[PDB]
Write a protein that binds this ligand. Structure first.
Ligand SMILES: CC1(C)C[C@@H](NCc2ccc(O)cc2)CCO1
Ligand code: NI
Length: 341
């Protein structure tokens, strides 16, 4: 059964609702981005219209084998009519191809669905600047004041400087970066760039990255592991056992591993500044956890909502417990009383 927060009232539309079978009354299924909790249920046998970005469409065709006749890519920042309703796709500042969706209902109501997003002041000068938004379907992943983390730029500076120092001290060190989905590509791309290397990876990950429209990508990535001193591995292998095993496979080319685990928020954010971050070390292997987020911090979320001034907010994350729902509702009321809407 499809939950209420994935339905758009006054339309035949659902958002990120592919795991519920045939949804009664749904004439078009929107997909905000290619993450598995959101696409769960899509396959080569799906036969309803899917609306999404160009990049998400490339991934549906090549990774999930969805037939081309059912994929409806839409350009960004452009008014489009879908089944008689005006819609606009906006960049969500999440992973590649991720969008927010503006729906202009026939009755005059305007709804914004953020999908997954990292709010930014640059959104205050998109097509959102024009008109009023009545209902907001909000990515509330980190909707609590304890969730603080640095800018993406600060985290990348730390990673580049750490990697460059380690490999300049020891030219026989290998750098490894963990991954389990699309997103956070800047971490491994920026490190490879400072080291003058391509990024080496499996055939399967190479395929995924070739779908993302990244400029000059053929110059940056490879399946030839022997040519590369920055390797990508599954996130599950970023531990002392898995990294030791990987080092064995490299044939005595390297004598040290420096590894990065790009997490979201972790409790050590409450204590430590990005500059003060230290690795876990065993012998010739060091592992850094770095807080590279593709979701809004609490303060970023608050600023966006107080600017937008929506009449009603519908959370799409942390909806499963009464304590979470009550906590989020108290913050939304605080924000409204402070700003005066
Ligand atoms: C050069 C600028 C500043 C213009 C900006 N265009 C509008 C926009 C802003 C934010 C969005 O999330 C979506 C669209 C994108 C790139 O950066
Ligand atoms: Ni996501």
């Amino acid at each position: 059964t499809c939950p209420f927060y994935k339905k758009i009232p006054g339309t035949g539309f659902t958002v990120d609702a592919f795991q519920y079978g045939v949804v009664e009354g749904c004439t078009a299924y929107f997909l905000t981005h290619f993450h598995s909790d959101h696409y769960a249920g899509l396959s080569k046998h799906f036969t309803f219209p899917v609306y999404c970005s160009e990049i998400t469409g490339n991934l549906l065709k090549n990774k999930l084998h969805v037939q081309e006749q059912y994929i409806h890519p839409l350009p960004l920042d452009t008014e489009c009519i879908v089944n008689g309703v005006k819609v606009v796709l906006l960049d969500a500042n999440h992973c590649p191809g991720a969008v927010m969706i503006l729906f202009y209902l026939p009755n005059g109501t305007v709804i914004l669905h953020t999908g997954d997003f990292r709010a930014d002041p640059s959104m205050e000068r998109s097509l959102l600047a024009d008109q009023k938004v009545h209902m907001l379907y909000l990515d509330t992943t980190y909707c609590s004041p304890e969730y603080t983390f640095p800018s993406q730029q600060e985290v990348i500076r730390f990673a580049i400087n750490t990697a460059f120092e380690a490999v300049t001290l020891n030219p026989h060190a290998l750098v490894v970066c963990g991954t389990y989905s699309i997103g956070k590509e800047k971490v491994f791309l920026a490190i490879a760039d400072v080291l003058g290397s391509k990024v080496g990876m499996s055939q399967e990950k190479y395929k995924t990255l070739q779908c993302l429209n990244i400029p000059e990508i053929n110059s940056l990535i490879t399946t030839d592991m022997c040519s590369s001193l920055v390797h990508l591995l599954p996130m599950m292998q970023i531990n002392f056992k898995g990294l030791q095993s990987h080092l064995k496979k490299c044939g005595g080319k390297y004598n040290q591993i420096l590894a990065f685990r790009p997490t979201g928020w972790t409790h050590s954010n409450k204590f430590t500044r990005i500059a003060d971050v230290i690795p876990q070390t065993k012998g010739n292997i060091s592992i850094y956890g770095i807080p590279y987020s593709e979701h809004s911090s609490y303060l970023e979320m608050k600023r966006f909502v107080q600017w937008l001034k929506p009449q009603k907010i519908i959370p799409t994350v942390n909806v499963g417990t009464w304590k979470s729902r009550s906590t989020m509702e108290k913050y939304f009321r605080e924000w409204k009383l402070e700003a005066g809407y």
